[PDB]
């Protein structure tokens, strides 16, 4: 469901951030590597 | 009816010869001898010398014979004894027939099916088992089919033969009679360019063709014992590829690997990876890795064991992608 | 040590391939025995066609110079080898021409303007009319030979009383497809006429560097078939050789290899200007009162004119689009093409 | 000295002919005539008919000759008039020379450099401009080299000839005299399997070879006018690929596109993609897209300009990637 | 209508290639003048080698059934064609064999055990000893021909007074490479001797299906070079024909094509011909000269068996091939991809 480049997903995984819990502020709702840093921050 | 892929082959040919009088089968030792692998056994005896005949020893000439006969309304199904000998007839296939419809704007066409065995695992001598599907997969105007089961073989060959554009039907030596399967009697067809999911999976997609399909299934079984569910996709047509089935399995698994018997620098694994990278990169958890043979000339007989990719190599690579 | 008669061997075989000649340079019948049975009207139509072709060549070179034509291989000097041979064929015969054999397929039914589209590089130039049995000019030297063997076997199997005729140059005889072609045709006893037009050169390579065989006709011996060496500059000898081969062929006896000796007028002082086929044949016909300067000029004006409207039909042909190229790849387009087709259909709009 | 690419190719041959008595140049119309494109111009005059000679019209024999000559200590540098004719000599190349060392386990080797022109944009007739590098890139034992400039052609050709294994040297027609560039006199080498950055950039990596390098440089300059800094990497050797250079650039840019004149199902673009996906998928901010020709037979001359990929196609594909 | 002498041409040309013979089935000389000049010791060695090759075929077929040998093409019945022709060569000559001409390259210097390794499919089987001028048996029917032309041109170019000899079967004469090879050699006037061993078959295809040419040697006519048809079952005829061709070649007069009429006693890889056997007629020939005897033949036979047994042992003691080995012999300077892969496998080979 989600859409994110591999760099994002493997960054999410490292940080242990279940990618399905992060929204995404990129085109068509793509989860950007900045949306995960904002999931951990807040 | 329990048939071996080779029998399934013979049956598809028998069926076409009977259903269409234009079908002609020729090549080196395919007549009275019935072929070096019995693929055409008893065919000349049933349909005549005028329909199933032998030819002088010259692959190039065979190609030309096919092209010519086609220009006269026949549906040539010539045979190249071993695909390693495709080099002698590379112009007839890639420089000629594959281009006739386009070259003549449709005025002429080539309903030709070239059958040829290949594949390792049976200790053949030099240039018999080389996987060269990669060369022809690159020529606009051709379709390359590679079955792994008797059922797929028959249905694809009948389709192959009926197609009105040149088709290359490669037959793996190790799959000729290594197992039997329920093959329906009578004529049926399997669309060309259509993949086939041999095993539904949810963790990783394992794409393969030829002898590598069964090795992917054998590896899937082991992978399950380890908590990894593998969806094994059998291409069954290496050109054109069934993108729809490929990406669909990928969009679902999020992980994948392509498995071929050819050398890494050959085959068609690189093209599948590319197609996935541009259509489903937004679904991939890890890179798509390839399982292929070392980049050396096909192995001397004795070295096939340590050289040819097997289930163990599919297992190991599936894991690597799994723990990326 | 005693010696094998190798010298005697080469001299003997050579003796089996003398040059067949019916007319000399002055237009005199030097071999009345093999004289071809041709009607006055037939004889004239042959002269007309040869003249027409010389004009097509001259105009083709000019149009190429002006950039109104693209790829073009001169034919001047080979009118007898090309036209007279074509003259011995029937509508039902299939021709597999080389890159230089555009003349032959034009007279067999291919419209002149398409011949020009072929030169420019347009697919419509290769959309041969149905019924007209020819293939677009073959660029891969020798490929037309093995294909000719397949075409011939096809006619044989359909029971047709027609033949497969194809041409290649002297250089082409060194190719493998050349040999395999005539061998296959031989092993199947197929109705095929194999013509080797020898103008002594393959681009800059003289025939002597191609092979050490004294004739190119003798190469037929390797296929186990009959070979004929003809004066490629004599229209009647070329016609007689081909007519003889068509007959041997439709009567189920097999193929024949024919070598015509001729020369090109330049591109692709001197001599051979007296050997020009149009010269002797003209003298031949004039002596029989079958040709006038008036008639010839009529043919010329008729030519220059038909050439103009042909270059005009070519110009008026619609430019090619990618979607066209794709549409003619297969009967049923594969996924990748179905896809690319839309991509370009959108660009095109 | 300011040279054209064909001039540099000649200079390099001349240098090798003088430097090594074993070097031999042969093929169709290369001797007295000096080559259809004047590539061997004057070489026969200076070194003799024993060193630079013409052969009968038959590519297969030319290949067989080179193999034989190499068995007798020579360093064969044969020519194939147009690579569209490689079909006639596929066995001698891929089935023989490329395998000799391997087949003989080192006892014999093939110091053979095969030269052959190819390329579109000059309205040549059929099978004269096809891009078939994709076929030979798949054969273990060969090295495929495709220069884009005078400087590179001369350096690689000297390297190509000195190499002791088979090397295919593809010379693009449009680049023979399209331009001049300063080229060092005397001998020098450019390693095989090494690419170079024809233009430094930071926003997107554009990988190309052949006439496409120029088209890519052209798109780069148009892109720079819009603040899009493109790095153009010239493969200069299509097999083996220079991975470090390629990957090093993508890791810096985050985005990339591979460009080729060949059709999408041909060329070596797909290999480049799979390798990037395999070694730097974690640096990608967008899929690695490809710019290639439609999957149809090479276009009839008049259709070249609407079929052949150009700078406008590259810009567009680069933008697709930027805006992903 | 006019008619060309097509039937005459076919006959007349073929007539130029009558079957050259010296020893008939009973071992009776029939071509005294052609009689090659060989010493008693030379004739005995020639017999020794043919008898030895027979046993090798008999043993090879056997080991191949036990699985101790892989690919193998029988040679029984072709001794005179294969052995007698090789007996005409000098060590300096270069041989380019076909998949069935292992014997020739064996007698030219290739160790028996490497010939067996070739069958098994092992690279060391093709590491021809330096100085031994042979190539591994060629599998692509026809390739050895165009390659032979090159070797020959190469020898001419270096001024060596030697030749290049290559072999192919009847079916192989239909290949384009077959024709291109003899046309090139002839065009370059290169010192090559092309042999065609006609056993009437190409696997299951009779030579009549290959071509309609009355003879195979006449094909040389397409290359404009000399051709000779010889009794493939006649040692002396073959020795002489090849010797004349070598002679012609070293004197720079060009290549020659030689067709040998023989028969292999099957299979691919009849009691009538049993009398046409080359060993039979040659035995009688030597015995009537007091040059041969059962004692001598039993010696060679045992000698062959012993060496064959030992060779099959050496092949077994050859270290099994590894991928690292295969990768290393691909190039002199391994390309990047192979460098990477070499480590992968070197690692995998650690344990
Ligand atoms: C397989 C292949 N190799 C080379 C070439 C290139 C070529 C085009 S034309 C030509 C010379 C042919 O001379 P020939 O005497 O046979 O015919 P003619 O023009 O009347 O003098 C060559 C070598 C092509 N097209 N195909
Ligand atoms: C280019 C190619 N195409 C087909 C084959 C397959 C083959 C291997 S052996 C053989 C028959 C050869 O018969 P021939 O009479 O020539 O020789 P011999 O066995 O001594 O009687 C074939 C067709 C190979 N190897 N290469
Ligand atoms: K088909
Ligand atoms: K080299
Ligand atoms: Mg061939
Ligand atoms: Mg010519
Ligand atoms: Mg045989």
Residue numbers in the entry:
A (entry chain I): 127, 129 to 169
B (entry chain B), D (entry chain D): 1 to 324
C (entry chain A): 4 to 271, 287 to 367
E (entry chain C): 4 to 272, 287 to 368
Copy out sentences from the published article reporting this entry, exactly as the authors wrote them.
The first step involves decarboxylation of pyruvate, which proceeds through formation of a covalent intermediate with the thiamine diphosphate cofactor (ThDP) in the active site of the pyruvate decarboxylase subunit (E1p; EC 1.2.4.2). The E1p enzyme from pyruvate dehydrogenase is a prototypical thiamine-dependent decarboxylase subunit from the extensive family of 2-oxo acid dehydrogenases.
Pyruvate was soaked for several days into the cocrystals of E1p and 3-deazaThDP, and this resulted in density in the active-site pocket that is likely to be due to pyruvate binding (seeFigure 2 for location with respect to the whole structure). In the remaining two sites, well-defined water molecules occupy the corresponding position. The imidazole Nɛ of H128β contacts the pyruvate 2-oxo atom, one of the carboxylate oxygen atoms and the keto carbon of the pyruvate. The pyruvate complex is not in an optimal geometry for the ThDP C2 to attack the pyruvate, and it is clear that either the substrate would have to be reorientated, or the thiazolium ring would have to tip substantially.
